[PDB]
């Protein structure tokens, strides 16, 4: 919703057991809403004391490992589980299938505020790094890099460049820092135009079918494969309204009785993983919240991408 005055690079963060089930329809890399919520929790915890705002997160995902296995005779996969403790009668409890993933991601954070002029860049960078080293990113603990060879501090780069060439060199150096990974971006325009292409191909086609067609490998008879522009993952694109926004004390057993609750349904969109050298600026990769609370639509996206 705003252009960041600076970009803070949180380095390689090893998230231990992240929620591999991103959505009721998708598994794998966690939701971008988890990353945006983590950055908002960082702004809630240490952002206010530094007189800065932390909005917008760019994910690089340097490493992914899924705690999964492939059973013999099946081409699908299953989630490795954890043994929950027994009940009070000594019996095994009912198992809820929860999957885990070891992530290694680096985050670009959009920083704007007067506190950037009040503190050194390395000071606020080290403060938000030591705050983020005791938090969670998708349900997993963050490994804060103890007793390895060379630890990685941040590099907060001011986006108000004095010259266009110096700004370009800063963005290319920051892209070179986060090199072995893929920027995950939102593709609402690509999914909508592919929906229009399928509607010209066949009418009454929903956005779900256009999302599904952009993920399966289509085999065409003369036997070739229908190509895709990018990786084109199905991402959770936010939450849509399923109920009116009830009063803060209205909903029974809410998390807090001061925040209003509204039952939601998952919104599914198309995301794309790209090499981060294929972007004009690294501020395009930032994932922003977008509530629009009168109509539900509690989305996260990448505005100012293309």
């Amino acid at each position: 919703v705003t252009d960041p005055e600076a970009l803070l690079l949180l380095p390689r963060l090893s998230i231990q057991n992240a929620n591999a089930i991103s959505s009721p329809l998708t598994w794998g890399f966690p939701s971008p809403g988890a990353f945006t919520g983590f950055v908002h929790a960082l702004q809630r915890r240490v952002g206010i004391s530094l007189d800065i705002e932390l909005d917008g997160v760019g994910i690089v995902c340097h490493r992914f490992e899924a705690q999964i296995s492939q059973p013999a005779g099946k081409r699908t996969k299953v989630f490795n589980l954890t043994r929950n403790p027994l009940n009070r009668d000594g019996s095994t409890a009912a198992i809820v299938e929860e999957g885990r993933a070891h992530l290694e991601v680096s985050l670009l954070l959009g920083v704007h505020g007067d506190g950037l002029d009040d503190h050194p860049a390395q000071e606020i960078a080290r403060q938000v790094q030591e705050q983020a080293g005791a938090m969670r990113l998708a349900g997993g603990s963050i490994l804060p890099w103890c007793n390895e060879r060379f630890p990685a501090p941040n590099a907060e780069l001011l986006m108000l460049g004095g010259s266009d060439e110096q700004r370009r060199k800063n963005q290319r150096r920051l892209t070179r820092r986060l090199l072995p990974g893929f920027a995950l971006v939102s593709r609402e325009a690509l999914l909508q135009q592919h929906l229009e292409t399928l509607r010209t191909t066949l009418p009454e086609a929903t956005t779900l079918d256009a999302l599904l067609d952009l993920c399966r490998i289509n085999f065409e008879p003369p036997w070739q494969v229908r190509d895709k522009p990018g990786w084109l993952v199905p991402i959770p694109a936010g939450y849509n309204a399923l109920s009116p926004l009830y009063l803060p004390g209205e909903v029974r057993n809410a998390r807090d009785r001061e925040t209003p609750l509204r039952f939601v349904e998952n919104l599914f969109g198309l995301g794309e993983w790209l090499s981060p050298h294929r972007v004009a600026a690294l501020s395009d990769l930032l994932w922003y919240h977008h509530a629009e609370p009168d109509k539900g639509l509690y989305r996260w996206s990448t505005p100012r991408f293309v």
Binding site: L179, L261, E265, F268, Y298
Partner: protein, 427 residues
């Protein structure tokens, strides 16, 4: 139209259920037939159904897939269609909607008593309107018909207070100006059932299996097929999927999650090309991603020009991906040893070694640290361009026409970008 045919159909349904439970019980004595026909043969069974419709609930989004010791409010609501483009949901389910049933595993019979097609339509939409054939086909008295209609139509409306349990998920969302909403999500079991049905047609359908056999026979077919690789199975009910919901009893567990995976989700290893002559043609080129990219360039090089420039745009994007992977290869070459390029060897591609190992400038103070700074090696991509010249088709029709000119233009532009990327490696 007539109430008499609806009465005949519901009497036939309860008689079929009576003879089914008589065949299941197989009773020949102990007066079990009289007790079976004393409660499931007359209108009082409908009154007994009045004791069963209040327990069941027809829902589209439920909480019971989240931890089964949680008791929340499962609600049947169709979400509004979003005005923003390019995103899907359960709002896309229009007439292709299957409503899940939650409650006891014994009252569910009355669900088909609300899902028959007597006059040609579903009886819940028949009971949502005050029709002339309605309220007479099931009850002789008016007030009994009204209370039976209210109890039978209450299976759609949510019961109890609006509530989400502690074991359910609740996630704060930042408002634009100074606020939060708590936003408890529910499992879209109707949407999950629709996606699972579509995947069933895609993977085990008759037309899909016929297209798979046509692919196996390498013959033509009027339609294609799909594969859906890397699917994940998430069983909700451990040993009792019927306890979750009725739709989860239709598909026993098996959430069938789509692979939203990053491209580095299957990182094999990092290897150092010691005793080899060129990195692009021996080690980097054997990775499967650039393999599929090179086969894609081979397929797109020998093709018609009718969509040419648009295809060329795709081709430009395609060729960009390959040099991206080259940088990605160099990226995982940042994960190797600092001084692997200084090891002994007769041939180890020393022309590319200034870019293969950037960390040897830390190893050698002046033996090779100043060499990469003074040389500024950006011609290596030209060598890679030579390998990329092995990615083009050997067709004289492309060379005669301007297709080779456009290929050389986009190749020169993308290796200009690659050489400019390799130039400022010293910063």
């Amino acid at each position: 139209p007539t109430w008499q045919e609806l009465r005949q159909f519901i009497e036939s349904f309860i008689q079929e259920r009576l003879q089914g439970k008589l065949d299941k019980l197989q009773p020949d004595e102990d007066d079990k037939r009289q007790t079976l026909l004393a409660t499931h043969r007359r209108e009082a069974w409908l009154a007994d159904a009045a004791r069963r419709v209040g327990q069941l609930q027809l829902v589209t989004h439920t909480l019971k897939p989240i931890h089964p010791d949680a008791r929340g409010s499962n609600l049947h609501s169709l979400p509004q269609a979003p005005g923003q483009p390019g995103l899907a949901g359960s709002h896309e389910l229009g007439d292709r909607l299957v409503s899940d049933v939650v409650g006891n595993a014994a009252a569910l019979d009355v669900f088909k008593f609300l899902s028959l097609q007597y006059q040609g339509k579903n009886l819940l939409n028949w009971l949502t309107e005050d029709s002339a054939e309605a309220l007479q086909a099931l009850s002789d008295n008016a007030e009994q018909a009204r209370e039976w209609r209210q109890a039978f139509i209450g299976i759609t409306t949510v019961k109890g207070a609006p509530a989400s349990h502690s074991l359910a998920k609740q996630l704060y969302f930042p408002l634009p100006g100074s606020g939060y909403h708590l936003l408890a999500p529910l499992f879209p079991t109707s949407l999950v059932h629709h996606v699972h049905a579509l995947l069933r047609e895609a993977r085990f359908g008759d037309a899909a299996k016929a297209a798979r056999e046509a692919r196996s026979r390498q013959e033509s077919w009027p339609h294609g097929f799909s594969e859906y690789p890397n699917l994940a199975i998430q069983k909700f009910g451990g040993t009792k999927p019927q306890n979750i919901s009725q739709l989860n009893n239709e598909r026993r567990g098996e959430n069938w999650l789509l692979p939203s995976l990053p491209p580095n989700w299957q990182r094999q290893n990092v290897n150092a090309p010691m005793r080899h002559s060129s990195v692009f043609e021996h080690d980097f080129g054997r990775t499967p991603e650039v393999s599929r990219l090179t086969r894609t360039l081979q397929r797109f090089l020998a093709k018609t020009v009718h969509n040419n420039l648009a295809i060329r745009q795709r081709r430009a994007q395609l060729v960009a991906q390959i040099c991206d992977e080259a940088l990605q290869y160099a990226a995982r070459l940042r994960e190797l040893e600092p001084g692997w390029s200084a090891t002994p060897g007769c041939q180890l591609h020393d022309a590319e070694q200034l870019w293969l190992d950037p960390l040897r400038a830390q190893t050698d103070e002046t033996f090779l640290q100043r060499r990469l700074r003074g040389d500024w090696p950006a011609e290596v991509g030209n060598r890679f361009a030579n390998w990329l010249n092995r990615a083009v088709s050997s067709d004289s029709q492309i060379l005669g026409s301007p297709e080779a000119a456009q290929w050389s233009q986009e190749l020169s532009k993308e290796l200009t970008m690659f050489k400019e990327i390799l130039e400022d490696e010293r910063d």
